[PDB]
Amino acid sequence: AGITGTWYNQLGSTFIVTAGADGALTGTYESAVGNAESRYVLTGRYDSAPATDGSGTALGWTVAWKNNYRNAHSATTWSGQYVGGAEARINTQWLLTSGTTEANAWKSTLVGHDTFTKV
Amino acid sequence: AGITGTWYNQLGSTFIVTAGADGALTGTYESAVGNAESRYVLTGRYDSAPATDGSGTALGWTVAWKNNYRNAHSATTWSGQYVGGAEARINTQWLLTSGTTEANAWKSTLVGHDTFTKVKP
Amino acid sequence: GITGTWYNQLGSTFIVTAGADGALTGTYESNAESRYVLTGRYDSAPATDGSGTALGWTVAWKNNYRNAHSATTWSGQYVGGAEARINTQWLLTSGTTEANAWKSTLVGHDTFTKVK
Amino acid sequence: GITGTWYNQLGSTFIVTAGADGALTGTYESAVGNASRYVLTGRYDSAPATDGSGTALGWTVAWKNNYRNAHSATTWSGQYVGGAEARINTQWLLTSGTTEANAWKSTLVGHDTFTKVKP
């Protein structure tokens, strides 16, 4: 599958993921420094039988920004595709929703994009 | 009362979820739309210690659209918050990315919004 | 069917003229201090098979009184009939430094109706 | 500033004029999709902050001209960042006209970055 291992985004974040035989993604999302206070559980899913026509492999995962040290009362989901090869990539778009009151719900969700590489 | 239970979105999809003590979301999703049949595995995360100021509970989950029956070569993530009340609700926005070639990647991702209630609309 | 006054789910008012050349022009009120210019485009020759009419518009949140240094775009479709609607999703980008650009853009949805 | 000819990462051409009143006007030529030139209109912050922040802006293209009509429209929302290599960084939504039953799949999302040099 080529997904299991450590990936790095464009802004100094790191995630270590295991892609299970059944389609499970499990691992940890952290900062470049990697101190315990920056590490969070991740969990998601991927297509364990992708097409063989040159298409990427669809996948997604979630991090809720609570660990044993802090809690931002928020969660990010990344949705994207893995592309293999010597320059392997995971290309994603993300949604970051914070817990808000109803009056503030209109501004609860940020959107962006992350590109992950193995180096 | 809480996240654990059976939920339905505005189109009649069925979201059966368990919120574990450790922050884990597990369960199954059955889609009323798209290249989908029967139940699919979901996993996700939620804030197990939300704020006490009246804010909702942040969460998210993923379905890869492969099961024993079909494989759409795609995955949806829902990102949102649970809001408790007399009519409990989970308000989400979602991204649905298909596996594509590089030339087609620009059109790989749909976006929308789903609202879930424990009462079927 | 697009020209006129529209109201979203949260008390904003959208006053628009749909011109023959595909232009959308008008004002968005989120009174004078709360009124902002809007411009956009719409499909002036939509299908007649039950499909909606695609459209989009932008408001930059500056007027003669205030400036939030931000802009919202709404992308969606007009649906005519007895309960006509404009169903949209939106992106709100603020001007930021590069270090804060990752959190520059909010996303959401607005539904507009011809009655409050 | 914003006025000029820009190119996205896929080779589309964005010819824009930023007027004194906050107006954006011009033409867009897409290197992608069911698309020659199309009219665009939008708005920008004509008095940005003076603290190093970018200039917020957005614009719309309806994909109808004298030669094709895709029954769809794209909005780009983003900010202009000046400097040695000026750049406009955007996220976009592309909505097609659909029936109600197909409305759930009416909107595509992505991100475009524009420079004054072709990719």
Write the layout of secondary structure elements.
Four copies of one chain form a homotetramer.
Chain A: E1 5-8, E2 13-19, E3 24-31, E4 40-46, E5 57-66, E6 71-83, E7 89-98, E8 109-117
Antiparallel strand pairs in A: 1-2, 2-3, 3-4, 4-5, 5-6, 6-7, 7-8
Can you walk through the features of this model?
- Four copies of one chain form a homotetramer.
- Chain A has 119 residues and is mainly beta.
- Chain A has one domain (2-119): Avidin-like (Lipocalin).
- In chain A, 0% of the residues lie in helices and 57% in strands.
- The first copy, chain A, has no helices and eight strands.
- The first copy, chain A, has strands spanning 5-8, 13-19, 24-31, 40-46, 57-66, 71-83, 89-98, 109-117.
- Chain A has an eight-stranded antiparallel β-sheet, with no helix packed on it.
- Chain A is globular and about 50 Å long.
- Chains in contact: A-B, A-C, A-D, B-C, B-D, C-D.
- Chains A and B meet through strand 4, strand 5, strand 6 and strand 7 of A and strand 4, strand 5, strand 6 and strand 7 of B.
- The PDB classes it as cytosolic protein.
- Keywords: streptavidin, cytosolic protein.
- The assembly is tetrameric.
- The entry is titled "X-ray crystal structure of ALiS4-Streptavidine complex with 10% glycerol using a high-pressure cryocooling method".
- Chains A, B, C, D are Streptavidin.
